[PDB]
């Protein structure tokens, strides 16, 4: 099913955080990395559509990072999709929808 071999914790970022940025939120993982290298990417508002690059993911490690302080009263939630691909470009998971909730 959609779960596949994704291993992702819930993602919460306080607003007004201190650097240094970029700051790790969680490590996104597919257990498909047991049968070959996996490379991670994200899409969605805040990643690849405006505001671009508030959130980024390190393609080899799966570290999801925020690049600047957030502001809950401006945008309290973001909806991203995580992707996992093989060296050869093929999807090893179905895109997983990720909620990011901005807190107090």
């Amino acid at each position: 099913g959609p779960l596949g071999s994704w291993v992702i914790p819930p993602i919460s970022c306080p607003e007004n955080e201190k650097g240094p940025f970029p700051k790790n939120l969680v490590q996104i993982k597919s257990n498909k990395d047991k049968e070959g290298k996996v490379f991670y990417s994200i899409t969605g508002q805040g990643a690849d559509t405006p505001p671009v690059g508030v959130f980024i993911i390190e393609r080899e490690t799966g570290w999801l990072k925020v690049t600047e302080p957030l502001d809950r009263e401006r945008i309290a939630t973001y909806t991203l999709f995580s992707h996992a691909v093989s060296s050869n470009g093929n999807a090893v998971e179905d895109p997983m929808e990720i909620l990011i909730t901005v807190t107090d």
Binding site: G1, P2, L3, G4, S5, W6, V7, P9, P10, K18, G19, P20, F21, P22, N24, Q27, N31, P50, P51, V52, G53, T61, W63, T67, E68
Partner: protein
């Protein structure tokens, strides 16, 4: 730099994106509209991130700027910054900048964000002694000697080719340091940074953490992906609340036993077989114990606040210690030897249940877990107890769906056949075993998976 008479905006700021932005800042209608030095002198901050800017030609005229954001653009050359000495904060991550010589005399800077560029030489930073925040990760820095006199630094990040951390020795104002993804093995200099509260140093080649002993203000420590075994030093760090030690070679967890402030603990991909030392860490909400050597996880039942737990790739047969952990929302135990999942019926808050590659035969105990949104039950396997050979040997199908109905076999070895509930073979000669497989899509709550497996039946 001053313009002398009224000048079109788009003759001052030649970059198309920037002149449009400035037209707005200066409250003009068309980019060909005139402005004078009077007008430009009123501009003291500029938020021009994410605008497709390739050149900042013209910013030299904005003599009174104290704060700029040009992050997420396509900047290369930043020469127009050279004489804007009232600048106190620069945000310029995610560009194409290689040469930061233009920042060298911006001595009023307290904040400089330069991550995700193509910087190698940071020599131009050496006299920026009022910096308290300096971010330089996702660059190709190898030499940080230029940082040695930045004695007001509070927050600091750099990468990705640094070995030698000696230049950090006098930076005792440092409170938050991120040295992840460098080439670092020797962190002995970190002993001198006694005000450190947060140290992130993932993906290096650290094996000796004794330098951390006197850094007792540390509340967050990440050493994911190093070469740690002996973590005795960590017992000194009693203010730790978030500790990440995944991807190492750790087996002895006794040094963690007193770290009762911990709410997040990552220990995945280590050499752990004994988790008795974790039994007192009752503030934990997130615990990762995947890819270890675990069988007896009984001490986990103490951790009543856990909402996230990983156990995948161990040797666990008895999952029932997690059944006490009623706040659990995501539970992962792919690749273990669990058969009886009945205790999991007590996990009424569970949303992600990842249980593939176990020995699960019967989904009925899960039927009321309707908050599930993600589910994995692929690739179960078990071997039944031997039964006696007969030419017409028959066994009951035991595979049960969440509804309680038997799942008919998908394939049956040796030309065998099914009539519910019995699988029957017709064997001309003795054979050492027979088997069957099943594969059945199923949804519990909103979570969907294929409940699948292979059942082996040895014959005497």
């Amino acid at each position: 730099a001053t313009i002398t008479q009224d000048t079109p905006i788009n003759q001052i700021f030649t970059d198309t994106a920037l002149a449009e932005k400035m037209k707005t800042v200066l409250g003009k209608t068309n980019v060909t509209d005139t402005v004078s030095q009077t007008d430009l002198d009123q501009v003291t901050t500029l938020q021009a991130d994410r605008l497709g800017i390739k050149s900042i030609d013209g910013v030299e005229y904005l003599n009174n700027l104290t704060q700029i954001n040009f992050s997420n653009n396509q900047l290369t050359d930043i020469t127009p910054l050279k004489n804007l000495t009232k600048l106190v904060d620069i945000l310029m991550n995610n560009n194409q900048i290689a040469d930061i010589t233009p920042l060298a005399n911006l001595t009023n800077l307290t904040g400089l964000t330069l991550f995700n560029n193509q910087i190698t030489d940071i020599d131009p930073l050496k006299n920026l002694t009022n910096l308290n925040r300096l971010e330089l990760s996702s660059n190709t820095i190898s030499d940080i000697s230029a940082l040695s006199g930045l004695t007001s630094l509070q927050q600091l990040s750099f990468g990705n080719q640094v070995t030698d951390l000696k230049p950090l020795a006098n930076l005792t104002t440092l409170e938050r340091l991120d040295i992840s993804s460098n080439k670092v093995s020797d962190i002995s200099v970190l002993a001198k940074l006694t005000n450190l509260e947060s140290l992130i140093a993932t993906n290096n080649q650290i094996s000796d953490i004794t330098p951390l002993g006197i850094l007792t203000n540390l509340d967050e420590l990440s050493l994911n992906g190093n070469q740690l075994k002996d973590i005795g030093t960590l017992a000194s760090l009693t203010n730790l609340t978030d500790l990440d030690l995944a991807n190492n070679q750790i087996s002895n967890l006794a040094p963690l036993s007193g770290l009762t402030k911990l709410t997040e603990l990552k220990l995945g991909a280590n050499q752990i077989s004994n988790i008795s030392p974790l039994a007192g860490l009752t503030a934990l909400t997130n615990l990762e114990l995947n890819e270890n050597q675990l069988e007896d996880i009984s001490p986990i039942s103490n951790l009543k606040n856990l909402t996230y737990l990983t156990l995948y790739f161990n040797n666990i047969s008895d999952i029932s210690p997690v059944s006490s952990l009623t706040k659990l929302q995501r539970l992962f135990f792919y690749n273990n030897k669990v058969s009886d999942v009945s205790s999991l019926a007590n996990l009424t808050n569970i949303n992600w249940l990842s249980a593939g590659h176990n020995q699960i035969s019967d989904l009925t105990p899960l039927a009321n877990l309707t908050r599930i949104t993600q589910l994995g039950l692929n690739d179960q396997a078990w071997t039944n107890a031997p039964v006696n050979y007969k030419a017409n040997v028959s066994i009951p199908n035991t595979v049960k769906n969440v509804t309680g109905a038997l799942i008919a076999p998908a394939t049956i070895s040796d030309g065998g056949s099914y009539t519910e509930p019995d699988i029957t073979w017709n064997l001309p000669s003795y054979t050492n075993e027979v088997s069957y497989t099943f594969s059945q899509p199923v949804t519990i709550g909103k979570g969907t998976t294929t409940f699948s497996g292979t059942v082996t039946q040895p014959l005497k």
